[PDB]
């Protein structure tokens, strides 16, 4: 669905200093932009 890399590409910040925090923020960040 979406290489490692692309991850940060996705992301648009640091997926390292970002996945320092729970999945749970991530629910909101894929509603930002992504749709599911």
């Given at each position: 669905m979406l290489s490692d890399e692309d991850?940060?590409?996705?992301?648009?910040?640091?997926?390292?200093?970002?996945?320092?925090?729970?999945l749970?923020?991530?629910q909101n960040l894929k509603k930002e932009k992504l749709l599911f």
């Open positions: 991850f940060k590409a996705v992301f648009g910040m640091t997926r390292s200093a970002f996945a320092n925090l729970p749970w923020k991530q």
